[PDB]
Structures are given as C-alpha cells and as structure tokens.
Amino acid sequence: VWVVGMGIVMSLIVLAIVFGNVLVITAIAKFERLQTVTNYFITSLACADLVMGLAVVPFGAAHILTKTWTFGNFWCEFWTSIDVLCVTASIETLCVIAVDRYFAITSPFKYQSLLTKNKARVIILMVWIVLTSFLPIQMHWYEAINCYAEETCCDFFTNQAYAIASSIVSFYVPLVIMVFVYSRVFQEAKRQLQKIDKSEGRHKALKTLGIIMGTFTLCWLPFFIVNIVHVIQDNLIRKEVYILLNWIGYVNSGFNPLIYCDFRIAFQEL
Amino acid sequence: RKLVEQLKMEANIDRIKVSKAAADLMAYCEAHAKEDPLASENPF
Amino acid sequence: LRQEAEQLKNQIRDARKACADATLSQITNNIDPVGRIQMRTRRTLRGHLAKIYAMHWGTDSRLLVSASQDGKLIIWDSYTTNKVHAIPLRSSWVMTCAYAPSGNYVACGGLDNICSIYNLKRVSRELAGHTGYLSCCRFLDDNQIVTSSGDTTCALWDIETGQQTTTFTGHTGDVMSLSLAPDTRLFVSGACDASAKLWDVREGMCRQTFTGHESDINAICFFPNGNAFADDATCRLFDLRADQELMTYDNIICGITSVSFSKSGRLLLAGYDDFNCNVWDALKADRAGVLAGHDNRVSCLGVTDDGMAVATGSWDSFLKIWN
Amino acid sequence: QRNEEKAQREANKKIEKQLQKDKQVYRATHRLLLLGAGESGKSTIVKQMRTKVQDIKNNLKEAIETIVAAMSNLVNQFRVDYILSVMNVPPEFYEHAKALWEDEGVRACYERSNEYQLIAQYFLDKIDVIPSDQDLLRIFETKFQVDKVNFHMFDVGDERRKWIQCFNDVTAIIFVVASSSYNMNQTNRLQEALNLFKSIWNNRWLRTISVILFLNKQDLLAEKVLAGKSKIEDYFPEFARYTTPEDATPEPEDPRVTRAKYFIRDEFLRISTASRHYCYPHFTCAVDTENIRRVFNDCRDIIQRMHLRQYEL
Ligand SMILES: CN[C@@H]1CCc2c(ccc(O)c2O)[C@H]1O
C-alpha cells in the first residue's frame, strides 16, 4: 500500500502549491501594495503558480496514481495545453522580474521612468500571450499513436522538432536573460560595496542573489535537459525517470517561487 | 519686561468652580448626546 | 527684577491649585460608558499623489479640501468621491489649508511665509506680513481669516485690504496650530513652548494662558459648547472657565498628530503618528476604540458640522473618510 | 435629473487626466534640501552650481561697519562715527567708511575677527578699491536639471527646525559645512555644525535620507592651517592624539593640512556611521566647477545604494 502513502505525499504537495501562492495573492489584493510594478509582477507570478497548482497538479497526480484516465481526450489535450501555458508563464515571470530589477539597478534615473501601470499591464499581457500552448491544441503537433488515439492512455509523444524549439523559447532564452541580468546586478552591487569600503574601517548579497538564482536553476535545468535528450536520443530515457523528475521538479518550482518572492505585515495581517 | 504685564493681566480672573464646570460639561454632553451620529438617512 | 514675575507665576499657580474643588473622574464614575464604536470607511477619498498635510471640512458639510506635499490643492465631494477642482499652489510646499464658511474662497497656506487665498468663483489676494511658514489658517469671516506663523506671532487679516488688522505675540515657542470658537469672539493657539493661550478677538490679551502639556503642543480644538478646549502622547483637556487641566489623557508611546471632538462632544477623535487614530471618551476619560485604514502617519482629522462622519488625512496619500 | 451627475463625472475625468499628466513630472523630478549652516558659504556652492550688486556692496560695507562697530563692542574717529551713525539705511559717508577701512582699526578687527561676525574682507578691500568681475560671487528654490536627470534644489534656511521634519522624501539633504570656521559663542562653529549633523542624521522623521556633506572653504581651512596661530589641538583636543589616516590622496599637498582635512572628515564620518543614511563627503573650494557633476554621481550612487537595500541584494 505504498502507493497510498505516495498519493498522500502528492496531496500534501498539491495543498502546499495552492497555499504558497494563494496567501501572497490574497495579501496583494487586500493590502495597498498594488500599483507597484514589482509587486504587480510578483502577484502575477503567484497567480500563475496558483493556476498551475489548481489545474495541472491534481490531474497529473490522478494520472500517476490511477493508471486509467477516467476522463476524455478533448479535455485531456486542454490539460496538456494548460500545463504548458502555466510552466511558460512561471518561467516568463521569473525572467520578467529579473529584467525589471536589472533595469532598476542599471539606470535608476530611468527605473521609474520606464515602469508604469500601463507598461506593467502590457508586459504581463505579452508574457502571458507568449500561443506556444494553443498551437498543440489546434495544430495537433503534440510510434505509439494508440495513446494519442485511445481513451485509456495519455503519454506525451510529440514531434522531435517541436520539442526543441518549444523548450528553447520557453526556458533557454529566459535562462540566458536571467543569468546575464543577475550577473550584471551582482557586479553592480560588488562595485557599490567596494565604493562603500573606501570608507576607512567601520558579501551576504552574494548569497542572497545565489539563493534565488539556484532555486530556478536546480528546479528547472534537469527536466529540460532530459526533454532535449529524449527528443534527440530515443532509447536512452526511461518513462518513469522522465515523469517523476519532470513533473514534480518543475511543479515544486511554483512553491519555491512564492517563498522566494513588507509582505510579513500583510501575511501577519490575516 | 512684558512678562510682568502678562502675569498682571492673568492675575485678575473670575475663576469658576471646577466641580461646577465639570457638571455643566457633563450636562452639555448629555443634552447633545441624542443627535450624535458617531443608517437609512446616513450618507455613508 | 524677575523675582516679581516669579512671584506672580507662583501666585497664579497657587490660585489655580486651590481652584480645584473636585476631580473630573468623580463625575466620570457615574457616566455610563460610550461603548466600543468601530468606524467604517464608507468612502475612500483617494487620488492625490502626495503626503496630504491638510484636511478641512466645509460648512456645507459636503465638501472637503486637502493640500499636497507637492503643491496640488484639490476640493473633494464626499458623496461622489469626484474632485471638483484642482488648483495647484504657486508655492511648492503647503503646510495648512482651510475652507471658508461662505465657500466663495478656499484658504491655502504654505512654507513660503506667504498666505494666499484662492477664489473658487485664481488667487484673490496674498498675505505675507507674518514671518516663517504659515502654521495654520481658519477663515473666520468672508474677509477675516486667522493665520499662524512660526515666528511665535499669530495675526488677523482683512482679506480685502490684505493687511494685518491686529497682532498677537508673546509665546516663547513657535505656534503650530490655531482653532477658532463658534462664537467667533475668541480663539486658541498651541505653540512649541508647551503652552496654550486663548487670545481675545480684538483685545489681543491672553484670557487664560495654560502650559500643562510637557512637549510641544501639536494641535488644539474647541469643544462644541465653546467653554473648553483640548509631541507627548498625552492630549490634555482644559476648561476655560476654570483654567485648569480638565483631565489627563497608557501603552501609547507615539506622538499626537491632531485633535477633533464630536458633535455631542463625547468622542474625542485623536490621531497619532502610530497610523491608528485612537478615539477616547471626553467625559469618562477612557479609550473606547480605534480606527486604522492608512499606512503613513496621520496628518490631520476633522468632523463635519452636521457631525455625520469624520475625515482622516494621512501622509499615505489616502484620505479614508471614516463613517 | 442626471445632468448634475454627468457634469461632475466629466469634471472629475478632466481633473484626473490633468493629475495623471502631472504625475510623470512629479515623480520624475528629484528634490534636494540645501540645509546649510548660517554664514557657512552655502550661497557660494549655490552660486557655483547654478543694480543689486552695488546694493550688495553697500550692504556688505555697512555690515562691515556694523562689524567695526561690533569690533568696538569687543576688546578718522569722526569718519567711524559717520558710518556707524548712518549704519541704518532705509558720498561723505562713503569716503568716511573707506577711510575707516583704511584705518588701522579695520586691520586690527580683520586680524582679530574670530569672535566677530562678517559676511568679506576681500570685498571690503575691493569696496575700498571700488560691478567688478566675480566681486558679487566673492525659500530660494533652485531648478537646475542635469542633461540626464531632472534635479531641483530646495532651500529652507529655526532652532526647533520643524522645517526639517516637514520634508521626508528628498533624494538627499545637502549639508554645507565650512571647515575653516572652527576657531570662530560658547561652542565652536565646527562643533555646532557637528551637533546639527548629528541631529539631522539621528532624526526620527528623516530616517531614510542620506546627506552629502561638502566641506566648503577647504582652501581657507588649509590657509588657516598653514599659520600656527590657533592649532586645531587647542580648539579640538583630540587632534593631538589623531594621526594621518592610512588611506590618503593628497592633491598634487601639505602633510599638516592633509592631516587636518582628514581629521575633520573623520570627525564628521564617525557621527555619520554611528547608525539607512550614507554620508558622502567631499573637499571643495569655490573655484571648483565640478560640483554639479559630483552631486550627480552621488545621486546616482543613492538610488542604486537604495534599490539594493529595498528588499534585494
Ligand atoms: C507531462 N508534463 C509536460 C510534458 C511536456 C512539457 C512540459 C512543460 C513544458 C513544455 O514545454 C513541455 O513540452 C511538462 O509539464
């Protein structure tokens, strides 16, 4: 009955994934932190995590636990598209807050100039729009054709060409942007710290940046590496290793993100 | 120098009873207490 | 020399002490408690991009006026939350504002040591006789508006002539707030010298100058009956008929920001820099309840003539008009 | 009838549109308060950063005569009486004042002027020589926006200093202090300035505001240092124990003057780093025209030093 315990653990994970973003969203709505571009972006990322945990996580958990998929394929493809969109939104917001912070540091005389409520809305809307999840529903681009045809199974056996471009546009460019921006931020902070050290007498920031970089790194890199590997190399990757690792790791990312996310007063207010 | 003048001016006052003033203030608060907003006609 | 002045001060203190017949708390004992009344923000006058340092009601009990920390002056309709007029101030800093009962003009002070009266129906006139920032204003008449300045010298103006009709001086410290009685025959002023003197309308002589408070007296307001008024947390109350401290007003450690009584006088709406105004019983001398809607320190409060509700202008750019 | 509601809605929409238009500039502008010590040369920094000239000369000469009259209070006889009697102002007096300035009493008063108050001896000689080039140079708001950023300087210029408590959103508070005026009345002017800086830094309202303390008249301080008439040790006893700092960047240059300047800066920096607010010191003279550039670099080093502290690395 070890499957029962595994399912209990998965249920706890789902509940945590819901709460870790629901609390932040509720605090952002009730308090006056709104209208700030950073706060708005954090709230948007929390909303993306909440949607992902509410929709994708439980259906995938049911799929893992009970072998049969008791529902139909018309909504199953919708589930796949929703999961793709949620993962893309989480990564995109994690990159967007990085870009906002990088511009704030690198040009404070234009930091408040560039950001605006309309600008924040446009950026969030563009991030959410950036299609990559609607195409598989329509184009059906999402060799084991029976699972794509039958009703019991739901196995993700898609185009090798689609997978590479999708993974690239979803994670690789966000990875490069985040790494470059945060390295620039670290260099600027180090320069400011040395300038302060020019005072005679009288680096935690390194760890502070490293925590938030490493969370995304160690939560996202292996899944996409394995995705690219299986798109290229067919017989190398087992199914169980792919599933366990991919699903759970990326999904845990949303909770880790809420934690990474002033808020203490709002959190203590409730 | 003018402080002496101010003190002399403040010297002559017809001080009222503290108890009487307190009672008068209590009665004044009692009389006006009926129409003290602090829902039908309230603008809100 | 100064020994005569010291003797006069001692005689005044002795007369005031012996004037104490009984404690106010004795009367308060029989007074039934007001009860925990929790105000609600039935409206939210928001949309003003600054630390609003001014909050004055209108005599019509419909419109309120607030002054920016950047120079924008906006009049607000509490019923519709629609800003009727927004006249920017020539001086960037405005330290106080006031609404004339006639409503034809709205008073707006500033830190430019010049008071300017704006015409609701442009600047009608400019007053600059006093020295230092305009501490506070309250238009007594359609032509007589009382100013207040950091020069420890409050003055009366004739709006049409634009010159100081009279003069008041004598306070050691800078005066920071003034309030006028409904009888319009007297007013009070709180100064940095931890003292309050009730000047006469025309004579210019302190009727009963009291100095009970310890730190600087930030604000003072008249009782509705007009026979009494009220940086340390304590906000004492004084009865002009007896010139004593009516009641001393414990865990609070913040600074007093503004004072305003209620129509019945029972409620003494007191707002602090602790972001939460504390409403205390004026007779029972007890703390009934509090309200808190904003984030920054409260700047000023007030009560409508009709007494329907109250306003709370803070530095957080949100004027949550509690009901 | 709903016409009243429609009209009020239209008016509110127009007002909100105007406010939204103004908010961009309102947030864009950076404001600085130039709280400077009295007679510390705050005008000189303002003049460099940015009919009455003759009136100023008469005002200064009368003030110089007022100092001369005050010089009598401390410690051509008819000529001195002519100016002193005509000191208040709503040819002959001009010449009498010129002669009194030429009189040895004026030289003695200028030599012993630490207790005395003056605006000015260079102009006094110039007034005796007498507008001339740089003679006038030797809430006054300022709007001098750099080509990159919008910079507006606010002047306040009040023992209680509630004017300070009024302001809480300035980007930085300029604290001009004249280092030379340390021999110059129970407590020395430098000590009073240090007390003012302590009060400003340890201000409950001004918790999150930095101060860019430009030690003005550093050339005058070095010149007074060159002579040994009043050692800093006599005024500041801790100076004798003090030695040269480990880090030093002398211009081109006097080890004694270098020690003095670094001591003054360290004395300010101790109270600065007691307790956030970051103090950016400088050594400036009137001729130095890079004041605006230094202020710009400091300001760019404020927000960057602020955002990183604003819940970040
Ligand atoms: C079964 N879980 C899916 C499978 C494929 C996939 C995921 C996430 C982002 C993508 O771009 C994908 O192609 C995973 O969440």
DSSP D5-53: HHHHHHHHHHHHHHHHHHHHHHHH-EEEE----TTSSHHHHHHHH--HH
Q: How many CB pairs under 8 A join A and D?
A: 49
How far, CA to CA in Å, does D313 sit from each of A91, A104, A182, A265, D21?
21, 13, 10, 21, 34
A223 pocket-lining for ligand 1 (C-beta < 6 Å):
no
- Rounded-to-integer distance, Cα C304 and Cα C282, Å: 18
By the 8 A CB rule, do A49 and A89 touch? no
A10 pocket-lining for ligand 1 (C-beta < 6 Å):
no
Kindly give the residue spans of alpha helices, DSSP state H, lying in chain A: 2-30, 37-65, 73-106, 108-114, 117-129, 134-139, 145-149, 160-167, 173-197, 204-232, 239-243, 249-260, 263-269
Q: What residues contact residue D9 under an 8 Å CB cut-off, 6+ apart?
A: C82
D interface mutation test: which of A199, A261, A264 has the most D CBs within 10 A? A199
DSSP A155-207: -----HHHHHHHHIIIIIHHHHHHHHHHHHHHHHHHHHHHHHHTS----HHHH
Tally Cβ neighbours within 10 Å of residue D228: 8
Residue of A56, A63, A81, A84 to mutate, ligand 1, most atoms within 8 A of C-beta: A84
The residue in chain D having the minimum alpha-carbon distance to the alpha carbon of residue A202 is D273
Q: What residues contact residue D236 under an 8 Å CB cut-off, 6+ apart?
A: D182, D188, D190, D263, D267
Annotated binding-site residue? D233: no
- Residue whose pair of structure tokens reads 């690198």 in the numeric block: A106
- Residue whose pair of structure tokens reads 């918790």 in the numeric block: D207
Question: Distance between alpha carbon B20 and the CA centroid of its chain, in Å?
Answer: 12
A92 pocket-lining for ligand 1 (C-beta < 6 Å):
no
How far, CA to CA in Å, does A252 sit from each of A20, A54, A84, B38, D96?
11, 13, 15, 52, 91
Q: How far is the CA of A85 from the centre of ligand 1 (A)?
A: 9
Give the full edge-to-edge strand order of the sheet including C175-180: C175-180, C187-191, C196-197
Q: What residues contact residue A49 under an 8 Å CB cut-off, 6+ apart?
A: A17, A20, A21, A86, A90, A254, A255, A257, A258
Half-sphere exposure of C186 (CA within 13 A, CB side): 19
How far, CA to CA in Å, does D256 sit from each of B17, D239, D259?
73, 11, 5
Neighbours of chain D (3+ CB pairs under 8 A): A, C
- Rounded-to-integer distance, Cα A171 and Cα D109, Å: 79
Does residue D19 belong to the interface with chain C, where contact is any CB pair within 8 Å? yes
By the 8 A CB rule, do D170 and D31 touch? yes
In DSSP terms, D30 is beta-bridged to D151
Nearest to D272 by CA among D184, D218, D212, D225: D212
- Rounded-to-integer distance, Cα D150 and Cα D29, Å: 5
Give the full edge-to-edge strand order of the sheet including D177-178: D177-178, D214-216, D282-283
Tell me the domains of chain D and their CATH numbers: 1-313 (3.40.50.300)
Handedness of CA C213, C215, C217, C223 (dihedral sign): negative
**C310-315: long-range pairs with CB below 8 Å, 24+:** C310/B38, C310/C39, C310/C260, C310/C269, C311/C45, C311/C55, C311/C57, C311/C64, C312/C55, C312/C271, C312/C277, C313/C52, C313/C53, C313/C54, C313/C55, C313/C66, C314/C51, C314/C52, C314/C275, C315/C51, C315/C52, C315/C53, C315/C69, C315/D168
- Assigned token pair, D238: 């801790």
- Reading phi first (left if > 0) and then psi (alpha if -120 to 50, else beta), residue A140 is in left
Q: What top-level class would CATH report for the domain A2-269?
A: mainly alpha
- Assigned token pair, D212: 């860019």
Domain boundaries, chain A: 2-269
- Rounded-to-integer distance, Cα C23 and Cα A244, Å: 78
How far, CA to CA in Å, does D151 sit from each of B40, D27, D166, D288?
53, 12, 20, 20
- Rounded-to-integer distance, Cα A257 and Cα A250, Å: 11
State the resolution, in angstroms.
4.2
- Rounded-to-integer distance, Cα D46 and Cα D31, Å: 15
- Rounded-to-integer distance, Cα A87 and Cα C130, Å: 66
- Rounded-to-integer distance, Cα D291 and Cα D312, Å: 31
**Number of domains into which chain B is organized:** 1
Question: H/E element holding D76?
Answer: none
- Rounded-to-integer distance, Cα C189 and Cα C195, Å: 9
- Residue whose pair of structure tokens reads 């000689």 in the numeric block: D125
> b/e per residue, A132-168, with b = 16+ CB within 10 A?
bbeebeeeeebeeeebbeeeebbebebeeebbeebbe
Q: What residues contact residue D73 under an 8 Å CB cut-off, 6+ apart?
A: none
- Rounded-to-integer distance, Cα A191 and Cα A185, Å: 10
CATH number at residue B8: 4.10.260.10
Query: Residues, chain D, total?
Result: 313
Question: H/E element holding D200?
Answer: helix D189-201
Helix (H, G, I), strand (E, B) or coil at A33: coil
* Per-residue 3-state assignment (H helix, E strand, C coil) for chain C: CHHHHHHHHHHHHHHHHHCCCCCHHHHHHHCCCCCCCCCCCCCCEECCCCCCCCCEECCCCCEEEEECCCCEEEEEECCCCEEEEEEECCCCCCCCEEECCCCCEEEECCCCCCEEEEECCCEEEEECCCCCCECCCEECCCCCEECCECCCEECEEECCCCEECCCEECCCCCEEEEEECCCCCEEEEEECCCCEECCECCCCCCCCCECCCCCCCCCCCECCCCCEECCCCCCCEEECCCCEEEECCCCCCCCEEEEEECCCCCEEEEEECCCCEEEEECCCCCEEEEECCCCCCEEEEEECCCCCCEEEEECCCEECCCC
How far, CA to CA in Å, does D155 sit from each of D46, D145, D290, D299?
10, 15, 20, 18
Question: H/E element holding A153?
Answer: none
Q: Determined by which method? A: cryo-EM
Give the full edge-to-edge strand order of the sheet including C228-229: C228-229, C237-239, C244-247
